[PDB]
């Protein structure tokens, strides 16, 4: 019997299925109260949080423990999200992000961007299809992003009319990076997301399977390789058909999560883990009820005091 | 009998009356040690933190639980703080901010600002009357602030010689916003505060009344409508006259707060709440003291030994 | 026996000797699992975090409690780190930073930089010897850093061909500042670090001595004046000679830290402190064992039952006679 840590030192990292504040209950899978911090946003994911669609909803756990239930939305990242030459693959970007949310001492901070000429700061839909901050360069220049020694991942998207990286002609679209970047002969617009910094990795999590209504993309499928991965109810890898719609509100997922979060009388303060099996979990110590011991003392006292009455009479009758 | 959660997973959000680090003790109302995180600043409030007076003192709770004791300073925001056309009302801005500090998964982050031309970044007292960060646009241009999809509140203050919002001529002063903004034909100087991001809202608080020395302004008075509101000692809504001055050090407020924070032997780990009534609060389990039960045994034993003697004596006395 | 708070509401703030995630185990001193949050980076310190060498590794504790085991690396700051006129001394900068990490409600945020002209944003090795963000000003201008009312410390480094502060000619190098700054007639390149904001100071820590392989520089030696300072194993003030090298992996430091973090059955939830002496620490309560009380009851009941038997024999042995 799985027991998940339901305690104020734990952050639940989720998507619409856990977004209790902002999603109609009919579409929730997390339908019990979570005593820790809830960071769950409809439509979001660890890659999607860098897209600019949800500019205020970055995941920023600061607790020792985490439980993750997300990933389905990250399968909308595809080839155009790793098309800038020298971009990380989505497989490797996702691995670093999921490891970071699970184990990491993480932050979200502004990414360095500069250039050999003054760029124009504005916002536009022309790079991604929705409004993000851009720098516009109206003549060709050197553009630099990130800093040597950095430890984290950021997303870049470009709409360039010229430019190369190390002599390789740029291709318009996006990419993920965990090192500094330099574009030469660059003209056009550039979006750079904040950096998801991942420093030390001694925090702890459970990673609950997030299923889609189609087979998972490779970069989220590979989360099965992490020691923290725990299966959740699914039908051949696909989200169950017992919900409100094909993607939300599964009765069996709800029962799985609720049961795992309502183990009775677990003293979470006494185990350094984001979960435990019920029989092995440390249990709360309770007040001792001494009423039954007191009843025995009374019943014995009764027979004794009546033994005293009897004895005296036997003593007199023997006189 | 009110018990407030006095525990490391709780953030106390306050003003001079709770600023134990930086205010003379004679002016404090929070005069007992708080076992959680204390974020309290002389002069500050959830609106005032955006004024530019507090560039390093924004409130940033990251804990599951909060206790708020602030608002009196926010009553110095007035008509000039909601005068930019399309600004939020102070009533609505305060409501979002107090709900955010109380229940929110919150962050404080830089607000996007851009324009159709390059302006100048500097600092001046010309916009608000005191030194803040400003952008100067000496030629009329399009100025853009915030981003579609954002979830939070920021403050804008302008000193403009031209400009309009959607064709409505701008009025100099300030406003609060929770959506992106666009000014057309803008010439002059603009201050933009950081954004108080409010994402999910499943954290928990108590909101303790903060009284002024006159009746509260409308936008703070309305905090009485929140489920978390708890009255604090007052005289017809005004701060009591039993303190160091008209605004600080009330003997009766001090006793109220100290009593509520020193309920003995509450096991806060076993209740998912920022307060409880004493009789209903979960109590710490203590080692059981068996001394009285052991004394009862010894008395019984003394008597039974006597009966053993007297019985033997009867048996022999049957000589 | 020292017991250090080993609990999820505590942040361990360290350097390579505690950087369990990223440092070879032979060079670790913290070799036991820490149940709280670990923020420890090889080569870093509370001053060095502002240098730009570790741009993603700023210390950002958000917990009520902290344990510090760092400082040796901050002795690489020297005269060139307080040479800009009006800079804080390293003694005063370190004091504010160590108090902030120990006791502070802290944040790490961007530092305001503005000017009378548009500064060119770029990155270069020319100011510090390694790559950092700089602004370049190619015309003599007014440059302003920080904001009135701020509460925190930031680092500035310059490579200027002209400029002054309040009429005092600038000197190239670095400085630490906790107030807004203004340079006049400035021309050249300027690096400005993020701000380590220190607001209220009612969080709590233990500050464990961090020893170097030579005697400590003055600005870290002075951490002994703080109430929270606790000595750690050392040989005449320098790191012991029982480690992997002269600066890491000391066998005696390891034992000191492991012993202090493995006090058995401490109920940290019942003490508002980052440490306690073992005998005084609150201990976990266990279920009460009533077996001895039950044995005493049962023994008594057996005896009283023999009395019933023998009384009846008596009560009868008399009615006969
Ligand atoms: Mg495995
Ligand atoms: Mg008994
Ligand atoms: Mg001392």
Q: What form of chain A results from the Cα inertia axes? A: elongated
Reported for the largest beta sheet of chain A, the result is: 9 strands, antiparallel
The assigned structural class of chain A equals alpha+beta
> Which range does the strand content of chain A fall in?
25-35%
User: Residue share in helices of chain A?
Assistant: 10-25%
Tell me which ligands are bound.
magnesium ion
| N- to C-terminal distance of chain A | 73 Å
Counting DSSP H or I runs of 4 or more residues, the number of helices of chain A is 4
The string of secondary-structure elements of chain A, in order, is: EEEEHEEEEEEEEEEHEHEH
Oligomer: homotrimer
Number of strands of chain A: 16
| Integer count of domains of chain A | 2
Most extensive interface, residues per chain? A-C, 49 and 55 residues
Rg result of chain A: 30 Å
Written description of the protein model:
The PDB classes it as viral protein. The first copy, chain A, has helices at residues 90-103, 218-221, 251-261, 291-317; strands at residues 2-4, 10-14, 37-40, 65-69, 106-109, 113-115, 120-124, 132-145, 152-165, 168-169, 173-177, 181-192, 195-198, 204-208, 229-230, 275-277. With 319 residues, chain A is of the alpha+beta class. The first copy, chain A, has 2 domains: 1-76 and 204-285, no CATH class; 77-203, no CATH class. The first copy, chain A, is elongated, with a radius of gyration of 30 Å. The termini of chain A are far apart. Chains B and C meet through β3, β7 and α4 of B and β6 and α4 of C. One magnesium ion sits between chains A (293, 296-297) and B (293, 296-297). One magnesium ion (MG) sits between chains A (293, 296-297) and B (293, 296-297).
């Amino acid at each position: 019997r799985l027991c998940l840590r339901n305690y104020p030192d734990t952050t639940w990292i989720g998507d619409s299925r856990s977004d209790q504040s902002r999603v109609n209950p009919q579409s929730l899978d997390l339908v019990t109260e979570f005593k820790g911090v809830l960071q769950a946003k409809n439509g979001n994911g660890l890659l999607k949080q860098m897209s600019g669609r949800f500019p205020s909803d970055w995941y920023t756990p600061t607790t020792k423990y985490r439980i993750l239930y997300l990933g389905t939305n990250d399968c909308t990242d595809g080839p155009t999200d790793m098309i800038i030459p020298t971009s990380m693959t989505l497989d490797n970007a996702a691995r670093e992000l999921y490891l970071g949310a699970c184990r990491g001492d993480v932050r979200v901070t502004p990414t360095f961007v500069g250039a050999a000429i003054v760029g124009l700061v504005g916002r536009t839909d022309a790079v991604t299809g929705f409004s993000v901050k851009v720098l516009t360069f109206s003549s060709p220049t050197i553009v630099v992003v990130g800093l040597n020694g950095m430890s984290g991942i950021y997303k870049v998207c470009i709409a360039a009319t010229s430019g190369n990286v190390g002599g390789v002609k740029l291709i318009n679209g996006c990419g993920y990076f965990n090192t500094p970047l330099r574009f030469d002969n660059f003209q056009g617009q550039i979006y750079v997301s904040d950096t998801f910094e991942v420093r030390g990795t001694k925090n702890k999590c459970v990673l609950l399977r997030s299923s889609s209504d189609t087979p998972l993309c490779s970069h989220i499928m590979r989360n099965v390789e992490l020691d923290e991965y725990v299966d959740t109810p699914n039908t051949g890898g696909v989200y169950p058909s017992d919900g409100f719609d094909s993607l939300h509100g599964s009765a069996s997922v709800r029962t799985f999560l609720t049961d795992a979060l309502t183990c009775p009388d677990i003293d979470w303060s006494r185990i350094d883990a984001a979960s435990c099996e019920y029989d092995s979990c440390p249990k709360m110590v309770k007040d001792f009820d001494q009423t039954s011991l007191g009843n025995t003392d009374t019943l014995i006292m009764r027979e004794v005091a009546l033994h005293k009455e009897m004895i005296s009479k036997l003593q007199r009758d023997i006189t």
